[PDB]
Design a binder for this molecule. Structure first.
Ligand SMILES: CCCCCCCCCCCCCCCCCC(=O)OC[C@H](COP(=O)(O)OCCN)OC(=O)CCCCCCCCCCCCCCCCC
Ligand SMILES: CCCCCCCCCCCCCCCCCC(=O)OC[C@H](COP(=O)(O)OCCN)OC(=O)CCCCCCCCCCCCCCCCC
Ligand SMILES: NC(=O)C1=CN([C@@H]2O[C@H](COP(=O)(O)OP(=O)(O)OC[C@H]3O[C@@H](n4cnc5c(N)ncnc54)[C@H](OP(=O)(O)O)[C@@H]3O)[C@@H](O)[C@H]2O)C=CC1
Ligand SMILES: CCCCCCCCCCCC(=O)OC[C@H](COP(=O)(O)OCC[N+](C)(C)C)OC(=O)CCCCCCCCCCC
Ligand SMILES: CCCCCCCCCCCC(=O)OC[C@H](COP(=O)(O)OCC[N+](C)(C)C)OC(=O)CCCCCCCCCCC
Ligand SMILES: CCCCCCCCCCCC(=O)OC[C@H](COP(=O)(O)OCC[N+](C)(C)C)OC(=O)CCCCCCCCCCC
Ligand SMILES: CCCCCCCCCCCC(=O)OC[C@H](COP(=O)(O)OCC[N+](C)(C)C)OC(=O)CCCCCCCCCCC
Ligand SMILES: CCCCCCCCCCCC(=O)OC[C@H](COP(=O)(O)OCC[N+](C)(C)C)OC(=O)CCCCCCCCCCC
Ligand SMILES: CCCCCCCCCCCC(=O)OC[C@H](COP(=O)(O)OCC[N+](C)(C)C)OC(=O)CCCCCCCCCCC
Ligand SMILES: CCCCCCCCCCCC(=O)OC[C@H](COP(=O)(O)OCC[N+](C)(C)C)OC(=O)CCCCCCCCCCC
Ligand code: SF4
Ligand code: SF4
Ligand code: SF4
Lengths: 161, 56, 368, 353, 175, 451
């Protein structure tokens, strides 16, 4: 039983019924956690950890803004929905989870063959840094330039002075 | 605590000095003449929840 | 309540004592009476003991729970409230409670049974023992509180034992024993309203169809005060009920709107507000929890009583015989379900349901 | 039985290893609460808890059992999601961070080339779980404390992350075990004495410990985010906060004092030469020895957590923000440029081996 | 619907242990009573000069912390309420609200003549004549102010009563 | 002030002054017709709005939202007892402070009129209940002044000796509790053991650790027990180290100075206008002390110095209160070395009780003992305003005598009452943690404030 399917089923239910802004900042965290875990267990543990290191800091800053802008509006308001229309919507959605229509690509299993030629064996992050700091160093230096612009941009927007 | 003489007789002569001094009015005294004829009290109450433990 | 609960400052008990009253009726006053309230730590005892102790009537409260009795001492002045550790299986402790009292009030009664006490032990065995112990101690007035549908020949083990208990109280204490038959009582932390205010009520489609005539608990506590201080009420049976008849389905649905659980079209159905179940499942689950759960849950006998509606005994006396007007649940329903309203807290504007608004809501509930 | 009984232990052996791992960490956390009051007591010329259990050894047990026997305060029985989700996120975060702590060579539940990132990433989740208590709450002291938690997180997160990255840069690895074994000939306290202070200062701010206890400031916000918490939700938050103190004390011993490496190589060999290596008793003693070295170093920093609480007054959090952004960040980013330049000048760029 | 009730079964506080379950729930009670007595967390509620003596109990000479006594700011973390000072009419509703917010089990200690019965200010227009008009009180400590040892003795009396609790054997033998 | 059209209780319509020209636009048209031809349907066309929200005079009805209002109520460690400090915050910045008091108002002034002068004395023990003996002294001085009596020489020195022991007892409570509220827990524990040693001297002379009705009109209730001065002198030989160790954790600490430097600044003008006295006045540069201005009870026969601040903030007053620690110890040593022999109470049995040995042999002593405890002593009609240098500041009593044995009126001037009345002026601008520092630097005991 792939229990990640159940997790996304609950998350989709709570995204349809979410009312206030605090629930939305919880839908975000309830989305990154399935992403981080599935990356950890299937494809990339490096990027599972990079997601946690960067998105959490963004989440708390996002949460602190909710405190300064919460404006009483959706606590006392009413929503109608209907339990039957919610579950029927989620049932129809769950029916079609085939993002791709290449049946052979989705059904036939493949393998790779290992070789011993790579005797200098290092992590993916060392190769990523090796290329990023040598061949795509321009991409890194532009990213540094964009980060500098954000620093100036945030000040010229928020600072009253 | 009320005190006795060594003979066992009470020291208090029901003179009601301590009742008048008591800043908190925590002392209540009723007195009369004893059967043997002595000036003795039959009622001496201190309200310990009203006393301020002041020694007067 | 009032300021002085007596018609005079002198009262001669039917046992021969003459009791004078002192003071204007405050905490420092006295009425000259000593009363014993069995079951004073219960829901109704706290109402009764508070009304007796506030006017200076010395109250003996026999307890089995040491923590539950502590709040009772605050009701009266120094020396007014007295506690006796007791058990209905202990006879010396029962006599000690009534040894000095001129009035004995019996509020002991359960709708359940446990490993130690059956419904026959409490609703009959205790009531009989207390009535006899009261008589040997020279108590002038006995007041026994049965249920609203007391009947010695009832199909319900609670209604039957309550009905038999009425008989045994008169057979021991004598014809002068007074009997009270309250309806379901509503108040703060009321057992009647608590099951209606609970969210995950299983099998409400069966349980909540019973119709009743609910009565304010403050009036029942006030009526008992009238009965004890008026000897013309000896040997009488009182049916204390409200003027209006409600079914628990109506109140359950009326409460839902006051709690505003219906603000969402999905939330009540998702949260378990409605939990329909076949009656055999309700029987098995009630039967199973009777030997597995340690806390008194909805038992088998309460399932049977869900079908039996409240029948007012027409030969008994009412609030009007005591010179009192019954309160209306419409004028008190909001303030007693007010603690359970979800957001409230001066968010934008409170919806204070007046007496007129509650009756308007009742029609809307009954509209399909 | 016999054979089935014997190989069932083999089927359950690693679960007991984890249970023993969990038990070992909880014993330190439980008795850190006792040790803090004893240490503060004698510094304050009192005794501290000595009446609950023989010489006070059951004080931690009594505090947990009493709090676990208390009523939980919440508007409704179904409102557990409100004041329990926060404590659980905080507790699960710090406990998962212990998966990468090696008590000896290879004795960590999780070993990977990115153990450093996992350590920082896991602890960042605990910060999120703290702010959840002020979830549109009507308690103004809980709300006021949530604002201060975010302000402190911004202060220490950059400095603490960058300091650990400099240590990882000196060894060119993000594996915690490799960093410990890289300190055989030198403990990083000597080359990076400024960074050890900054790491400990960041640890005090991360754990909301004085002089950075602006979150749970009793004299300011009665109990901070805990003012509405009672019974089990209060224990879990209290347990997780003291778990974080043990974790950051152990990380101070790992990043700068060689982790489990012996204080004296001569004495370490002398003690281990008494036991035959062909017997299982050698590896018990070695496990006790290596963890003892880690325990001694971590005990000193757990002592230092208590020591700074009993000597320094509290600093306002708005001053903490200026201190971290105007003082600590410029210094740490200077060393992140200083250190590679020194190593390149002497042809000593690190590699993993 | 007949019944037959025993007559000579003793009360809970005097009932001896007869079977195994009597020992089992007594052990269950003792452990919980031991913890609550050991973790004695009063609420910081010093009102007047009676608070000075309560602060001296935490002072190094007496050091209540050695007995497991820790003062908590929030009522949620407290199980003992020590009323140390005069309770005025302006303060009584706040005192009752603070008491009501303590999760059970909760005990109240009344310290000093003001809290016991009014004391020096008994005949004042703005003083409550005893804190037991507002909240239940478990023990009364006398003095103006009670000494630190007098307060510690009062705490020791409460801990003695807490160690006699039989809550779980009450369920077994009285319910 | 007055409900107007653009400003009322529930909302306001705020318009700023127009910086730009009042440009006139007439004849609005599109390419299909004039404005009035489509103005009926222009409500659905956002591009047809003639009112611009950036204009300074754009009408906006804004509900008046309560600012973040916090009850810094009685149940709070910062408040030294029962203080319902109501703060309107902007985040954590204080915008307005409303100290609500009377939670410890017990009608002491009303009750005193019903008591004789001797019976009313213990009421003063319970106003500033850490500086107990100083409170008794100001009432005793006022009654002695009305009685036209004076304490003998040894009695005056005893009131000076325990006047400075009491001052140390107060500053240990004040300085260390203020430090503890800032976050320095340890100094509180060290110095409270010094309070235990000092309260031992309190208990030996009177029999009460705290409420020692020992200073009475005419002198002191009982003489010093044998061996008391040696214990006091022995305590004094070590107390210098206790003060130094406390200063090791606070005085030069950068964290302590960051919490106190520039916090709660008070100008010398505002200190006088708001009636601040003692350390609050002296921290602002004013060198004024009541022990110097109107000397009393052997303060003229000892030597001490007054510390005066220059910046009038919390750090200046901390240094001043630490100097007074050492100046009191200087006075304590002098009193121990200069205590004269002789009677401790006035030699008048119409005011002071006679000795018990004389009471039980002399008829005139027994009459005076009987009359003193059943009627008190009459005080000549008049009034007085007597002030002392209490550890909190200027404490004074305004007593009115009607010629009887009961005081007609007794108004107690509490130094903390005036200090708390300037809190809103002082704490504005500062943050919520700074209010904790400002409260602790005023030395607020609310029994004194409310009485
Ligand atoms: C350690 C476990 C922590 C979580 C345990 C509590 C379980 C509750 C749900 C957790 C996340 C599941 C998906 C929910 C996404 C957010 C949607 C939301 O609004 O929260 C649901 C919660 C329930 O409120 P409810 O009364 O049912 O609905 C409103 C009725 N008008 O409304 C609330 O606002 C309460 C939310 C409390 C704070 C939760 C913060 C998010 C934590 C997520 C961590 C785990 C990541 C998600 C894993 C599951 C994925 C489905
Ligand atoms: C417990 C929940 C475990 C959930 C699960 O599916 O775990 C799978 C586990 C696999 O077997 P495992 O015992 O972990 O491997 C040992 C090989 N030496 O198989 C199991 O489920 C065994 C789990 C039983 C052990 C539970 C904890 C034992 C220690 C309690 C003290
Ligand atoms: N809606 C209602 O509440 C109705 C009430 N009644 C009857 O009114 C009376 C008052 O009950 P109420 O206050 O409302 O709610 P409770 O259930 O709390 O009444 C039970 C009271 O009697 C005591 N009791 C029960 N069994 C025993 C026992 N073996 N030994 C000693 N005491 C026992 C209980 O003591 P303890 O508190 O220590 O557990 C409690 O005080 C009851 O007899 C009830 O049958 C009838 C119709 C309506
Ligand atoms: C896990 C064990 C929990 C079992 C609880 C239990 O057994 O309790 C349930 C019963 C009932 O007894 P009660 O709780 O007084 O009934 C009142 C509660 N009703 C109304 C729900 C029935 O107890 C017994 O049969 C007594 C023996 C239990 C000894 C301890 C085992
Ligand atoms: C941890 C191991 C040391 C136990 C300390 C101890 O046995 O403590 C002694 C205990 C607790 O009583 P106390 O009043 O807290 O003892 C403190 C003594 N003082 C007051 C002088 C400091 O007494 C008993 O034997 C009673 C209980 C029976 C034994 C079960 C003890 C609990 C077992 C759980 C942990 C194994
Ligand atoms: C700063 C004080 C600690 C210190 O100086 O600790 C560093 C020093 C020296 O050890 P090292 O040269 O870093 O290498 C560590 C060599 N062992 C493995 C032998 C410890 O440890 C001690 O002398 C202890
Ligand atoms: C290059 C080598 C780097 C050295 C590495 C260490 C860096 C430390 C920087 C400190 C600077 C500082 O204390 O800053 C002070 C700042 C702001 O002070 P300010 O407002 O500017 O006033 C001071 C400016 N004066 C004096 C010039 C006017 O806040 C503080 O009080 C921070 C107090 C931190 C105490 C934390 C306790 C840690 C205990 C550790 C036990 C193991
Ligand atoms: C060689 C080593 C020493 C060189 C020192 C030069 C100081 C120049 C200076 O301070 O330049 C002066 C200016 C302006 O001064 P001001 O304070 O704005 O006002 C002037 C004083 N008034 C008020 C009297 C007019 O400041 C700056 O632009 C500060 C920029 C410094 C940024 C550093 C960030 C941290 C990076 C650390 C590495 C990772
Ligand atoms: C780990 C958990 C350790 C629990 C220790 C608490 C035991 C306790 O509280 O023991 C107290 C109880 C009984 O009470 P008693 O004092 O013997 O009185 C009873 C008087 N009799 C003996 C005459 C009946 O003893 C036991 O039955 C201990 C059994 C558990 C081991
Ligand atoms: C499993 C979950 C975690 C473990 C939790 C442990 C908590 C600690 C237990 C509470 C301690 C407690 O109760 O000991 C304190 C109690 C309190 O005695 P008292 O009330 O003053 O009356 C007792 C004195 N009389 C009756 C004379 C007045 O001493 C006892 O009676 C202890 C006596 C029984 C000792 C039996 C020991 C058997 C061996 C046990 C070890 C193998
Ligand atoms: S009445 Fe009071 S003062 Fe007079 S003798 Fe008796 S105890 Fe002493
Ligand atoms: S010590 Fe107590 S009883 Fe005696 S006079 Fe003083 S207040 Fe009254
Ligand atoms: S009882 Fe005495 S010491 Fe206690 S608060 Fe009242 S006056 Fe002060």
């Amino acid at each position: 039983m792939n229990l990640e399917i159940l997790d996304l089923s609950i998350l989709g239910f709570y995204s349809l019924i979410s009312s206030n802004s605090f629930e939305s900042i919880a839908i975000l965290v309830a989305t990154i956690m399935p992403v981080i875990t599935e990356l950890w267990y299937n494809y990339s543990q490096l990027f599972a950890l990079l997601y946690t290191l960067i998105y959490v800091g963004a989440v708390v800053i996002l949460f602190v803004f909710i405190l300064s802008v919460i404006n009483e509006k959706e606590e006392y308001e009413y929503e109608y929905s209907g339990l039957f229309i919610l579950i029927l919507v989620l049932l129809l959605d769950d029916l079609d989870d085939n993002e791709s229509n290449d049946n052979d690509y989705n059904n036939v299993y493949i393998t790779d063959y290992a070789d011993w030629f790579n005797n200098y064996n290092e992590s993916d992050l060392s190769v990523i840094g090796n290329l990023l700091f040598t061949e795509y160093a321009l991409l890194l230096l532009i990213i540094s330039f964009i980060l500098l612009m954000s620093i100036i941009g945030l000040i010229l927007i928020v600072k009253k002075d | 605590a009320l005190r006795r003489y060594p003979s066992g007789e009470e020291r208090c002569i029901a003179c009601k000095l301590c009742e008048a001094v008591c800043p908190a009015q925590a002392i209540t005294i009723e007195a009369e003449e004893r059967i043997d004829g002595s000036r003795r009290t039959y009622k001496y109450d201190i309200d310990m929840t009203k006393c301020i433990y002041c020694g007067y | 309540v009032s300021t002085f609960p007596l018609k005079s400052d002198i009262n001669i008990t039917k046992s021969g004592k003459t009791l004078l009253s002192v003071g204007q009726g405050g905490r420092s006053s006295r009425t000259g009476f000593t009363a014993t309230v069995f079951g004073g730590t219960g829901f109704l005892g706290r109402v009764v003991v508070s009304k007796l102790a506030k006017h200076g009537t010395n109250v003996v409260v026999p307890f089995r729970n040491d923590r539950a009795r502590r709040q009772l001492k605050v009701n009266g002045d120094l020396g007014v409230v007295n506690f006796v550790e007791f058990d209905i299986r202990n006879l010396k402790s029962i006599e000690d409670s009534v040894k000095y009292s001129d009035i004995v009030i019996n509020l002991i009664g359960t709708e359940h049974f446990s490993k130690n006490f059956s419904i026959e032990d409490v609703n009959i065995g205790a009531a009989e023992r207390i009535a006899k112990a009261a008589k040997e101690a020279g108590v002038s007035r006995l007041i026994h509180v049965s249920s609203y549908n007391a009947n010695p020949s009832s199909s319900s083990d609670f209604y039957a034992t309550k009905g038999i208990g009425e008989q045994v109280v008169r057979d021991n204490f004598g014809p002068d024993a007074t009997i009270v038959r309250p309806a379901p009582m509503y108040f703060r932390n009321s057992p009647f309203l608590n099951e209606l205010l609970q969210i995950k009520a299983l099998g409400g489609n069966v349980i909540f169809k019973k119709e009743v005539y609910p009565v304010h608990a403050l009036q029942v506590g006030e009526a008992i005060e009238r009965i004890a201080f008026d000897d013309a009420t000896a040997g009488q049976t009182y049916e204390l009920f409200g003027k209006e008849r409600y079914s628990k389905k109506e109140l359950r649905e009326m409460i839902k709107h006051i709690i505003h659980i219906g603000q969402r079209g999905y939330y009540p159905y998702s949260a378990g507000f409605y939990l329909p179940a076949p009656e055999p499942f309700l029987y098995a689950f009630a039967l199973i929890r009777q030997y597995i759960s340690s806390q008194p849950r909805f038992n088998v006998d309460q399932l049977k009583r869900s079908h039996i509606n409240q029948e007012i005994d027409q030969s008994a006396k009412t609030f009007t015989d005591l010179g009192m007007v019954p309160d209306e649940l419409s004028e008190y329903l909001y303030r007693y379900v007010k603690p359970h309203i979800s957001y409230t807290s001066q968010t934008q504007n409170r919806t204070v349901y007046s007496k007129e608004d509650i009756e308007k809501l009742r029609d809307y509930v009954n509209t399909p | 039985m016999l054979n089935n009984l014997f190989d069932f232990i083999e089927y359950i052996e690693y679960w007991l290893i984890i249970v023993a791992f969990v038990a070992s960490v909880l014993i330190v956390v439980a008795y850190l609460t006792v040790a803090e009051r004893k240490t503060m007591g004698y510094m304050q010329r009192r005794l501290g808890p000595n009446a609950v259990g023989y010489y006070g050894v059951l004080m931690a047990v009594a505090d947990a059992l009493k709090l676990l026997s208390k009523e939980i305060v919440l508007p409704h029985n179904g409102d557990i999601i409100y004041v329990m989700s926060g404590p659980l996120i905080s507790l699960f975060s710090v406990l998962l961070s212990w998966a990468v702590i090696p008590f000896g060579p290879g004795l960590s539940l999780l070993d990977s080339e990115y153990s450093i990132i996992y350590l920082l990433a896991s602890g960042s989740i605990g910060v999120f779980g703290t702010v959840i208590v002020g979830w549109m709450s009507n308690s103004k002291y809980t709300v006021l404390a949530t604002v201060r938690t975010t302000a402190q997180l911004i202060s220490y997160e950059l400095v603490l992350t960058t300091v650990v990255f400099i240590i990882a840069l000196i060894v060119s690895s993000l594996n915690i075990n490799v960093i410990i074994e890289s300190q055989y000939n030198i403990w990083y306290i000597i080359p990076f004495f400024p960074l050890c202070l900054i790491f400990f200062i960041s640890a005090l701010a991360e754990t909301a410990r004085p002089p950075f206890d602006n979150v749970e400031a009793e004299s300011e916000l009665v109990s901070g985010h805990m003012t509405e918490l009672s019974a089990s939700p209060f224990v879990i938050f209290f347990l997780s906060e003291y778990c974080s103190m043990v974790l950051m004390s152990t990380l101070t011993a790992i990043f700068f004092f060689g982790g489990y490496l012996p204080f004296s190589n001569t004495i370490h060999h002398l003690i281990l030469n008494l036991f035959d290596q062909h017997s299982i008793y050698y590896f018990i003693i070695e496990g006790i020895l290596l963890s003892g070295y880690l325990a001694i170093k971590a005990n000193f920093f757990m002592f230092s957590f208590v020591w700074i609480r009993a000597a320094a007054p509290r600093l306002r959090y708005d001053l903490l923000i200026l201190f971290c952004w105007y003082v600590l960040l410029p210094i740490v980013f200077a060393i992140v440029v200083f250190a590679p330049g020194i190593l390149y000048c002497f042809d000593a760029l690190p590699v993993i081996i | 619907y007949s019944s037959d009730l025993p007559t000579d079964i003793p009360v809970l506080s005097k009932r001896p242990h007869t079977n195994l379950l009597d020992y089992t729930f007594t052990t269950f009670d003792k452990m919980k009573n031991w913890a609550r007595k050991s973790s004695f967390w009063p609420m910081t509620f010093g009102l007047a000069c009676c608070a000075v003596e309560m602060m001296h109990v935490s002072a190094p000479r007496y050091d209540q912390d050695r007995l497991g006594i820790i003062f908590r700011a929030s009522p949620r973390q407290s199980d003992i309420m020590i009323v140390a000072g005069t309770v005025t009419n302006k303060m009584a509703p706040a005192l009752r609200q603070v008491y009501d917010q303590m999760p059970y089990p909760r005990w109240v200690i009344s310290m000093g003549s003001c809290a016991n019965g009014g004391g020096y200010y008994h005949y004042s227009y703005s003083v409550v004549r005893g804190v037991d008009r507002i909240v239940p009180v478990d023990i009364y400590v006398p003095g103006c102010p009670p000494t630190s040892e007098a307060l510690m003795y009062g705490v020791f009396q409460l801990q003695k009563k807490m160690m006699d609790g039989q809550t779980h054997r009450m369920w077994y033998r009285s319910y | 002030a007055a409900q107007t059209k653009d400003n009322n209780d529930f909302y306001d319509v705020k318009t700023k002054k127009n910086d730009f020209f009042p440009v006139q636009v007439d004849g609005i048209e599109s390419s299909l017709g004039k404005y009035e031809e489509f103005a009926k349907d222009a409500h659905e066309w956002e591009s047809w709005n003639l009112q611009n929200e950036d204009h300074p005079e754009y009408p906006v009805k804004r509900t008046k939202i309560r600012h973040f209002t916090l009850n810094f109520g009685p149940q709070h460690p910062a408040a030294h007892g029962v203080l319902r400090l109501i703060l309107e915050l902007h985040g954590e910045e204080i915008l307005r402070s409303d100290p609500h008091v009377g939670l410890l108002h017990r009608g002491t002034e009303k009750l005193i009129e019903s008591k004789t002068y001797m019976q009313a004395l213990p009421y003063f023990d319970r106003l500033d209940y850490v500086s107990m003996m100083t409170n008794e002294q100001v009432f005793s001085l006022a009654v002695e002044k009305l009685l036209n009596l004076e304490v003998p020489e040894r009695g005056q020195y005893i009131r000076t000796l325990f006047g400075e022991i009491t001052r140390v007892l107060n500053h240990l409570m004040s300085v260390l509790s203020h430090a503890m509220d800032v976050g320095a827990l340890t100094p509180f524990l060290w110095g409270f053991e010094e309070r235990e040693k000092l309260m031992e001297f309190y208990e030996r002379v009177s029999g009460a650790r705290l409420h020692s009705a020992y200073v009475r009109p005419g002198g002191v209730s009982q003489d010093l027990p044998a061996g008391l001065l040696d214990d006091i002198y022995m305590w004094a030989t070590q107390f210098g180290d206790r003060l130094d160790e406390t200063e090791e954790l606070l005085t030069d600490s950068r964290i302590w100075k960051q919490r106190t430097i520039g916090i709660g600044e008070v100008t010398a003008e505002d200190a006088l206008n708001y009636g601040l006295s003692g350390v609050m006045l002296r921290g602002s540069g004013v060198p004024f002390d009541i022990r110097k201005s109107q000397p009393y009870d052997a303060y003229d026969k000892v030597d001490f110095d007054i510390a005066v601040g220059t910046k009038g903030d919390c750090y200046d007053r901390y240094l001043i209160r630490m100097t007074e620690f050492r100046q009191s110890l200087r006075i304590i040593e002098q009193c121990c070395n200069q205590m004269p022999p002789g009677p401790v109470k006035v030699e008048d049995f119409k005011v002071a009780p006679p000795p018990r040995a004389l009471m039980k042999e002399d008829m005139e002593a027994l009459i005076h003992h009987f009359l003193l405890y059943t009627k008190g002593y009459a005080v000549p009609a008049g009034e007085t305003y007597t002030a002392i240098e209490a550890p909190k500041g200027e404490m004074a009593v305004y007593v009115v005598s009607d010629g009887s044995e009961r005081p007609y009126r007794c108004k107690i001037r509490a130094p903390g009452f005036a200090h708390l009345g300037a809190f809103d002026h002082i704490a504005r601008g500062h943050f919520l943690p700074d209010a904790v520092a400002i409260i602790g630097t005023m030395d607020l005991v609310f029994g004194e404030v409310d009485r």
